[PDB]
């Protein structure tokens, strides 16, 4: 490809899907870089936690 000084060029990358019966996407969510910490209440609804896990 070539991009000169402002000219955008939308790359069209083909991939496949993922299979929901092959990966579990409800596993421990947003894993922390280092273990431990305060362990405070999440303060969010369980359903919200589901969509945050999927969107990560």
């Amino acid at each position: 490809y070539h991009v000169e000084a402002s000219h955008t060029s939308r790359i069209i990358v083909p991939i496949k899907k993922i299979d929901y019966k092959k990966y579990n996407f409800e596993n421990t969510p947003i894993p922390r870089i280092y273990p431990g910490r305060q362990f405070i209440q999440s303060g969010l609804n369980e359903e919200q936690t589901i969509e945050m896990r999927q969107k990560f």
Binding site: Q38, F39, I40, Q41
Partner: protein, 194 residues
């Protein structure tokens, strides 16, 4: 008789439902003949320890919050020398006004008090509304003794009371010297001349 030496009064203060009264019954003499709580408000409990070969009597007044007694509680902090703000780690809105309780209690209690800060219901440690290190820090720049009580183990709260009565003791420890009374002589037959 009575035969104790000093008598301190120590308020327990906090929001309602933070678990102060169940904390009070486990570690100290209780349910002697007290009529109850809310009938007059602010129930009184007693604890008798000894420090430095002096006997200390401590009265603990668990303040009750019902909005109706708010005017009455002000007059009950008059002369209060020992204090304990209790907060629970499960719920979170008590810590928003824990500072307000400290401000109201620095007002009109004594010239100088010794306020402890105690986290009730650490049995629900996993349900931690506020981190313990933040409350530990907030105790550190407010000169406060800080405790975490399981409510299933009374050793922590009992240790806190012993150290609080020590720090409030040395604060009021009036100097004493001796009462020996051994100086006897002068048993004569009195050849007086006035």
């Amino acid at each position: 008789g009575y035969d104790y030496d000093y008598l301190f009064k120590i308020v327990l203060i906090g929001d309602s439902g933070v678990g102060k009264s169940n904390l009070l019954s486990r570690f100290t003499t209780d349910e002697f003949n007290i009529e109850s709580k809310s009938t007059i408000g602010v129930e009184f409990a007693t604890r008798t320890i000894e420090v430095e070969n002096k006997k200390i009597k401590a009265q603990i007044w668990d303040t009750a919050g019902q909005e109706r007694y708010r005017a009455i509680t002000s007059a009950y902090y008059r002369g209060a020398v020992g204090a304990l703000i209790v907060y629970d780690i499960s719920k979170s809105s008590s810590y928003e006004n824990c500072n307000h309780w400290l401000t109201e209690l620095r007002e009109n209690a004594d010239d100088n008090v010794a306020v402890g800060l105690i986290g009730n219901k650490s049995d629900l440690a996993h349900l931690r509304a506020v981190p313990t290190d933040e409350a530990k820090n907030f105790a550190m720049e407010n000169q406060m003794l800080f405790t975490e009580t399981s409510a299933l183990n009374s050793d922590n709260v009992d240790k806190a009371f012993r150290e609080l009565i020590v720090a409030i003791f040395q604060m009021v420890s009036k100097h004493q010297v001796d009462l020996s009374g051994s100086g006897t002589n002068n048993m004569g037959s009195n050849g007086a001349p006035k």
